[PDB]
Amino acid sequence: MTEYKLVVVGAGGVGKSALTIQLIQNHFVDEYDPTIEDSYRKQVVIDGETCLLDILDTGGQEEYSAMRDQYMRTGEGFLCVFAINNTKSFEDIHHYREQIKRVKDSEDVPMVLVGNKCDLPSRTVDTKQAQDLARSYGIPFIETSAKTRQGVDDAFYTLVREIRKHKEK
Numbered sequence: 001m002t003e004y005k006l007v008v009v010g011a012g013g014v015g016k017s018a019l020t021i022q023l024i025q026n027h028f029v030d031e032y033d034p035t036i037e038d039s040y041r042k043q044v045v046i047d048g049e050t051c052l053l054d055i056l057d058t059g060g061q062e063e064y065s066a067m068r069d070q071y072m073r074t075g076e077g078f079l080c081v082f083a084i085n086n087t088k089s090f091e092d093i094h095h096y097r098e099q100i101k102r103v104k105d106s107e108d109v110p111m112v113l114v115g116n117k118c119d120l121p122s123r124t125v126d127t128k129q130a131q132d133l134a135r136s137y138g139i140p141f142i143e144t145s146a147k148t149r150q151g152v153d154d155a156f157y158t159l160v161r162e163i164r165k166h167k168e169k
């Protein structure tokens with residue numbers, strides 16, 4: 001039915017692949033830890049409507065990607081992931097948002113700010129820090145753990161709903 005093109009961006013090590021694999025796993029394969037960018041597919045019903053999600057798991061700003069610009073052109077919505085115990089990854093979110101704005105020539109791009117690894121007791125980026133950053137961008141903030149699966153489905157579903165809302169403006 002309705003297809004959505006989703007792109008996961010963020011610094012290396014924050015859990016982009018772990019979040020994506022947790023979403024798309026059919027668990028035929030026990031463990032899967034990709035190291036190269038790839039695209040994954042998931043069919044899911046969101047608010048009664050069957051959605052086909054294509055999810056691009058990008059690499060950090062350091063791993064070269066020839067098709068990076070084209071991925072951002074094709075992408076309809078972006079998960080901007082940082083880790084709640086890595087302040088640099090949180091500061092890097094500005095860089096990733098600027099790249100997307102540079103390619104798409106818009107400040108009005110569907111995005112969700114994702115604070116991953118919320119299963120950890122120790123944390124260096126506070127909830128209000130991230131909620132304030134999300135406010136400054138006009139985008140939702142969601143805390144996730146690819147370990148406990150907390151918030152993982154909701155992060156992606158929230159992004160789909162952001163894309164729908166944008167398409168109806």
Ligand SMILES: Nc1nc2c(ncn2[C@@H]2O[C@H](COP(=O)(O)OP(=O)(O)O)[C@@H](O)[C@H]2O)c(=O)[nH]1
Pocket residue numbers: 011012013014015016017018019116117118119120144145146147148
């Ligand atoms: N505690 C915790 N560790 C995580 C979580 N998500 C990912 N990791 C770990 O962080 C490391 C990097 O994860 P990875 O998925 O490769 O991150 P990527 O580079 O952003 O794709 C791996 O060792 C994972 O085990 C999480 O939600 N909680």
Ligand SMILES: [Mg+2]
Pocket residue numbers: 016017018034035057058059
């Ligand atoms: Mg990865």
